[PDB]
């Protein structure tokens, strides 16, 4: 039978996919990740599929790997599915041709997401699914959560009966992450629809040595074409099969579908053709406008491939005179996007009435497609009739955009209550909204919808919840813009974001703040808000959620209080039932540790209900004094681009505001100054031993060491306390540790590792520190950084260099950023960074925040993110460029040495040439050439003068996480390191795919809990270091900051100076590991990681072998027996102990045994006397030679594959035997 | 000057590609292998391109690696090329979106070959080039050994001046391996057709720590769409 | 019923032997990432690599399996880097069965390895 | 399963055109490279001999365990194990937690003690 | 009375240049695609040509 539930598109389709598949080969990619993870969870819980079995699910190394596995499973006779999107779908394309080419019933469920071009987007659009429209897969689109469920079922059933693989897709986030109350079928109902005859035929034709066949032959021109057309019959029948299953499923659900469905006026004159979630919004607008008499309609595309023109026309009103086809993609240079071209083709082949056809583009990267935009589209059809337009953006560059009137009337059905909640990261707002949706949906007949907007910031980010409740189906697939209820859970937002925008008149505005008194409110509430509340007669409520939570014992935790506010004031339910239901549920959930935790929550509810009174305000708010504008100084770019985006106005930036190639300038994060740390450090100079370890360790570059001369401290604020500098080389300098309180994330690592027993750093509330430190950091920032005093690569001296990566969006206490920041302090001014997609690319470059910056001379890391799978090859390419361009420069230089260039110029050239690959010398002489050739514009000296940005030796680095290095990019990494070229690979090992949600990677350790290893990973951690060391010519090393900063610096210097490939693997802590005492213990955890023997440190240096010494050196000591407490101090290990104590004990013992063995193997490596030795190069010499020249026998075959321009000469093809056999035969045949 | 020679489509194309590129990341795949092998032998023989330099050619682990290297070389300011077909071109698709997306003057010379479906085939058809039509690469076809030479040259010249990568393609075997007596141009002649200012501009906007920028950001719904339409003036 | 279903699954009665055949170009280069992951999975599969020390079919191009000094396409003056040690790399797992064979040297060791690997 | 190099490598290589053609075209480099190959295999065999002589090797666990069930790595974690990102968003995510913006457990507790009030 | 339009620049597809090569006398036009996209309403070149005639409106 049926069953109601409130869930998202992902779960709705995974529900069906699990039931219908026996095997799933998967790989994580947002926003489809949820499906694979649920399937895994259900298989582990014991959920049965229609065959009464738990799903066999395996995580591959990439989507390409998953696609080949899917093909193998299907070829081998097992119903198979996979979940993917965007970049991942692209990697599956080659196997798609094979899966459809071999008529296999596979089903791919795709959360349609944008492809990375000028930029990467995890958001929704059809660029990915259209990229695969030629693979031969049938394509069924679902446009709503309820449809994702239905279409997923049709796809599987039709795939099984048709023998044509299906791609079931729905919009990324807009449908995959939207919550709706829907109806799902029982697995037994799905099972009943399966064509048993077809299933048996599938089984019988599959690969099997009992009745084998050959698949995947290589064919010549004589038969290939015929073989390709032999599947025709199958594709002619899929449409009818899809129709029949839509009907068979409908008889069970009551929901009918056609390949193309029509809604709107039967006599519509203007019709839109669309696909995906846009269809719901368009329909909602049609109901509204048609009720006013407008003759408009919409054709919803269900089956996109095969494209059946007959079914399309069956849905087209004869009265349509103008048709607009909406494509949610962009194919540069094409005469029109996919859907548009298909529709145009239908009309030309029909050969009759040709209504006006227009093409429109919308929703790229989940761009809003709101009711007003639909109005634009319909108005365009009766108005200008612009063709190839875009809607949702202002294209002031090519003028392709339709103007959009946002005063358009709200079109949600009568009786819909709309809500918006503004929350702060981890304050539980989203969780309570999802709970509120469940509660309301399970206890009323109301339809409920939820959608959530998050922040690119991983910590202290702002969240915005959009909820809708109604007596009628909610087709609003766009954000709420005219809310009945608006709640701001963070009082900090009040002054910075337009929180009451579009709120209805008489709407309810609930605010969390301690401004209970009218004077306090008048003191904080901006004029604009007061005027808005006033002029709209808003039901304004204020509630000190933090005081109530504290008092009832919930310790400032506000979720329950704000939750109560919603259930009481939103008005979707009567008070009695609400408070009732809310309470019943508190007992449901919680109900754990005694009735005490239940009491506090229940009490908090009653206290909330009571204290929840309408804040009364003076009519004088009608015109509160429009405040001035105490806006600090920044730059034009931050003023005109990033600030607008950070304040959520990016949607208003026209196309003219962006660089055609998507680039961004460095350093835009310098001005964010978010100030979201709860507690920040306070320097206690009386205990400071002036070590610079606190600055070295900061994950956000929030600590600024200061070394000034007396003169530089004259205009210094009174509180700018500075110690006289310790150290011989610092005699006479004044030292200060300046805390950047607004950029601090308040993790506590600095304070945690500050050497002195009597700490020089103590955590304190941000407010107790900002007034003094803000003007202090400001002043210190203008003090020249003393980079020339101490060695750049010394612990202390490194912190006297300019950090070139600051204030990133990484989590508070992130274990990756400290390493990167230091790397820039050592090479920043001359590095190229090819960054693999992952956390490091996300905190590294989530527009509009750019943490990497330039130094005082304008030099900084040239940073780029290509893809997730190609970081190494990307960096190798940059290295090829430098080789080619610098070789060109060298050639010009030698050339100019043989000319009448001046003695000085020649000295410089000769100097540069000799020190070409030396950072010190190439810069020394390049800087002379810059001076010496200044102005030179002609001839040879002119070309050399124009290549100055190539004078100093560059440092190419490849940054990537473990998922990249051990999995998807391993092949690339391996090849690049094997090239022997001069590149540097820095792997930030978090032992999981962090960014995407903690999925297991081959870097995940034995027994660690992570997605797809939820019972603890049952294979040991892949030994990347030892695998790379077998080459002998690659510098390999491991590091752990918390264990030894010096060893880290030593490794950086040795790896970078190695004239060949270098691989550095760093232990990076991460919130996914669940450090028990907080991330502020990362350094200490890194310390233990090494002491326990879990993460041994070593260095493999090939040049030592070149000089007779052992290249391998251990840098840490044998395991000290602390591994158990090390593991148990991380939830990724502790959860297993609490859930499966028996296996967890076993797995922790296995880990201790693994590390013990590994260390002993490393000890012998370091003791060995036998080692691979070799020189840096030697050889080359102009010239080439073919492997076949002068061979005694044919060296190439008779194939089209080996044919070359010069091939074809006669030769002995080995059909007459050996040279000796032929000789002996010759003597024997003397005659 | 012009020179009368008797060769096939691969060679006629390779003749030009070598002259116009500084860097090449290759991977072998019939029927385009001949091109990369020729480029490699010529570089090893010391042949000079239009900059008087021998080509910097490296063999990657696959075409995906070759395409990522090509993207990196172009991003770092080196005129770059590659040769491929069929299954190999499919592997380059992810990077193709990035190369065109970042308006890079890359040039792929493709010997159009069938895609493996019910069977593999090393022979010619446009299945592969059509699979890459939405990548944003301009696509210029040559229908004869003589046009392969001419379009190859046009593709390079146009990619440099337009900042839109080009895919120069011709029929696998039917053109790539057909031998014809044709005319080819001297490298000097090709060099004189190059837009020197566009080229200087390509190098000045390339990745360099001396004057850095960030490329390949991650963008939200607020600006992605605008950012994708920003390249219209180029197309 | 049940016996009918079981009767219909007879082509699954006998334990099967899953083999993956490929050359050095596949195993050392393009398919290395996948080969590596599949071996790390710990599942019962058998990989048999026919190492010709070049991409043979396509015309003798070098691969990471090509040895130092061997001439091949893209190694026209002799390859200047040594052969990649795929065997020792995979042995680092500890749970993968790895072996090398050479028929001309020992047909018996070849047969012994087949039996042990399978 | 085989023995130490018997010294026939030079003849081995020179009997194959892939090596000999180099000898005829770039005699000097070829000489170097064949000696390099001889050194490479000498070392490798020596490394394999130690591998065969070692007493250091790790246990072999085929399979076994699974323990019908699974758990999320964030379950019962003291601090948030996921970020505010749409990438980490999941159906069951959204519950309040300590986002590490207030410092260590120890640092937090001490600030409590120090601000007793 | 027959003709042939040779496609040089397939992308970007410029309809103006396509029509600059089309004879006004052409009553029937066959578009040949050297590919197969199973289930598509037509192959790539054909689809592009159709769009050209549809947008022209003549
Ligand atoms: C071809 C392909 N497959 C999948 C993805 C999805 N991605 C991943 C699985 C990356 C996880 C990174 O792992 P690791 O270990 O290298 O780094 P770290 O732990 O530091 O994060 S983040 C990323 C993205 C942004 O698109 C998304 O889907 O969230 C992708 N970009 N490309
Ligand atoms: C993605 C991709 N890149 C390139 C090729 C081209 N192919 C190769 C480079 C294969 C050579 C394989 O070498 P190796 O060492 O693994 O095996 P062996 O030496 O035994 O031959 S034969 C083949 C093909 C048939 O399609 C072609 O282009 O000719 C391909 N099929 N797919
Ligand atoms: S608490 Fe963390 S973010 Fe703040 S200064 Fe210290 S190390 Fe940096
Ligand atoms: S870690 Fe502590 S002692 Fe060292 S420089 Fe920083 S504040 Fe001073
Ligand atoms: S690596 Fe972990 S701690 Fe760092 S930004 Fe990513 S999720 Fe956060
Ligand atoms: Ca190096
Ligand atoms: Mg990771
Ligand atoms: Mg081979």
Curated annotation (Swiss-Prot), chain B:
Subcellular location: Cytoplasm
Residues annotated as binding pyruvate: 30, 113
Record-marked site positions (Important for catalytic activity): 30, 63, 113
Top-rank taxon: Bacteria
Binding site for thiamine diphosphate: 63
Assembly description: Homodimer.
Record-stated family: Belongs to the pyruvate:ferredoxin/flavodoxin oxidoreductase family.
General function of this protein: Catalyzes the ferredoxin-dependent oxidative decarboxylation of pyruvate. Required for the transfer of electrons from pyruvate to ferredoxin. Ferredoxin I and ferredoxin II, which are single 4Fe-4S cluster ferredoxins are the most effective electron carriers of POR.
Name used for this protein in its record: Pyruvate:ferredoxin oxidoreductase
Organism: Desulfocurvibacter africanus (Desulfovibrio africanus)
Lineage of source species: Bacteria, Pseudomonadati, Thermodesulfobacteriota, Desulfovibrionia, Desulfovibrionales
Gene: por
Residues of the full protein shown: 2 to 236 of 1232
Curated annotation (Swiss-Prot), chain D:
Protein name: Pyruvate:ferredoxin oxidoreductase
Cystine connections: 80-97
Subunit structure: Homodimer.
Family, as annotated: Belongs to the pyruvate:ferredoxin/flavodoxin oxidoreductase family.
Polar residues compositional bias, start-end: 101-110
Purpose: Catalyzes the ferredoxin-dependent oxidative decarboxylation of pyruvate. Required for the transfer of electrons from pyruvate to ferredoxin. Ferredoxin I and ferredoxin II, which are single 4Fe-4S cluster ferredoxins are the most effective electron carriers of POR.
Gene: por
Region entry Disordered, spans: 82-117
Domain of life: Bacteria
Protein's cellular compartments: Cytoplasm
Native source organism of the sequence: Desulfocurvibacter africanus (Desulfovibrio africanus)
Signal sequence, start to end: none
